[model samples]
Target: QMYHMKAIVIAGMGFFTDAYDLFCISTVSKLLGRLYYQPDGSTDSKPGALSKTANNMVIGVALVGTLMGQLVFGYFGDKLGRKRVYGVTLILMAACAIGSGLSFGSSRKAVIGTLCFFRFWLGFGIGGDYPLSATIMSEYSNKKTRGAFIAAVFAMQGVGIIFAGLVSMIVSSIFLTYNKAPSYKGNHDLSRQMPAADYVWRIVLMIGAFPALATFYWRMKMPMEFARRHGLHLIGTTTTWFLLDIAFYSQNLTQKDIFPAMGLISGAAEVNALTEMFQISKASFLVALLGTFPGYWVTVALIDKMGRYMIQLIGFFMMSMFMLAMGILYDYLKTHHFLFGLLYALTFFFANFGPNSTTFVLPAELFPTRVRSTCHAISAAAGKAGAIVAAFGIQKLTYNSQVKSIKKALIILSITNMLGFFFTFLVPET
Candidate 1:
């Protein structure tokens, strides 16, 4: 009678594919900078960084595509049924993932432009997964395991995240050994950046397609499954995700500079091409492994009993608390890497354990099935809008990697998180 586990894996693998496509962007973006942005006459002490605008475009453009995809696919989900739209998004995502790696010709302008073009569509497909899977889970859920079931689906995001970093790390390790020689000062100095740099990002990007391809048929075979508080509910879902997203993405922005600043790794000047990429992936893995992934699992273990409302509320307040502490003690925390890392990890821990998971789960249950996909997509769309804000605002705010800028961004994030805490009241308790 009940065989939702099949449903969960089919849907869950899709979520993992969705995550791997985007989550590895942090590591890939850095390699892209080294691959294409190297100065002709040699570069600065820290390596050729992506111009802030280009960097934002690389990340933000996908978010816009995702927002659009969510609306379009979610609409069709309610109208035609989950199956049609669901099947298309994965293949679309797979194609775009391959396209992102293949993007090229002429100048770096054309290359990155092509990369953006492909990723934009990739985001669109990524967008479809959110409400589609959420809707599917709702139909399959019985009241008793409903909370755990859906939250478990979203937990794959954590698994996907961990592997995103792990895969990047492993791949980079392979390349590092194969291409071991070094001296590019950008050149003959070859401290890090190399010809192999080009292949690393593409391979990482292309491999994201495999997970999608693997699960395609099973999902096509499954049954179709099918939100919101009127005004307050809408405000609750949209605003909380909006606020949480700012805090979430902002932290990720900081991650670019955070690891080095924390003294976990040397500057880009010190390492070889793959060395830097490998470390970046390793650091990313640590954050997810210690905090992000575990927090998600821990929450899934208890979310049904604790309830989404409380979990989210606690998450928001907890993030605000730690982030505020970090902001205020930025100077003191800077010198003490362990404590700083602890606070940093804790914020991520609470985030998934709190708002991140709940934001995804709560939207589905809050509305009617007829419009559930649409409203959840709208709420998710709003979340991306906030992500765009962070990509712009936080990157600039943390541009200098100075204590002041990072602190300011963290302080602002704390405020955003607390605002999320306050908005939690407008949502459903369970």
Candidate 2:
């Protein structure tokens, strides 16, 4: 129990910070649009916003970096030993987290470009955390409780997500109270005119560093064990994560864009900058708290008892059913916000309870200690590749018409989940 608790805290904090850095962008991406995309003194007729390509780059670049980092760091963890490389990832994350906040340039293009560069590295550091943390937890646990322990460490992702929303909500509310500018109704000049408005996103991005910094010393102090490595386990873990992330990131990364289009959230054009942030943050917090958080705990409770295979199969199946229903009922649900919200929330629920948690846990247990970190990193990188596709490819397809795009995207996601279900067979139960 002592080892289990220690492993979860040390490892889980990295996952928490990883989730915070990755998902908080959803809360602030629009704010970036208003601050940089809009022209000065332009009427509300044309609010500044990111082009679809730039938006995709802004979100997807980090995932690309993550994919690279997973490959690089995963290899190093095996060659150099886990404890030696563990602290390096945290330091890199801390540096890049602050750097992302400080991203500055004379023009909007320069600023966003710089921001993307920092985020890519930030993501690189985060990618290192996935395999390192999972491998460490797996090694430290007893076989009987090993699955639960790894699941618990990964479950910190849900808490990190909830905090992302909560922190954004709190920060935006403080600014909303002080920056009581009238709503941006037909007047673009007033939008994002406040100087302090520029600081909001930087602060949010920088906050991710503290958790990583906090856990650094403890991670380095942990002992290392040497074991013989293998190859086939690497192939299995990587393939599964690749398949799972395509569907997962497609839905999760694009939700900020999707929810507003679906009427679950309002567009920035319709509200003040702070109000828009607050609403998105509130909605994000509620859904994560209700839908995302519970799934992690349920996985912790049931994973050891039911085993990864059954849990993942059930989760993927339920997710497909919900997604298909959403696609089929898109037009009706668009008008019926409450019903749409409920169904949308359920998809997240099953996702966490199912493939998302299972994929992370299974990799650690399936591989031998010598290759565990490397294989987990390979799998995690594949997942990031899927996220890259989501941010760049599927999200672009959904931009044409809100109603049609969303309907089509949901159907595609439903199919993606079903594919994930089928792919589960490639991975044997640990």
The most accurate candidate by lDDT is 1
Tens digits of per-residue lDDT, candidate 1, 219-240, equal 7666513222266787788998
Model 2: per-residue lDDT, tens digit, 65-99? 88778777766554775665676777998899889
Task: Work out the TM-score per prediction.
Answer: 0.90, 0.90
Our tally of clashes for model 2 stands at 5
Show the colliding residue pairs in model 2.
Answer: 37-48, 38-48, 43-188, 44-187, 44-188
Q: After superposition, how far is residue 306 of candidate 1 from its true place, in Å?
A: 1.9
Candidate 2 TM-score versus the reference: 0.90
Clashes of each: 14, 5
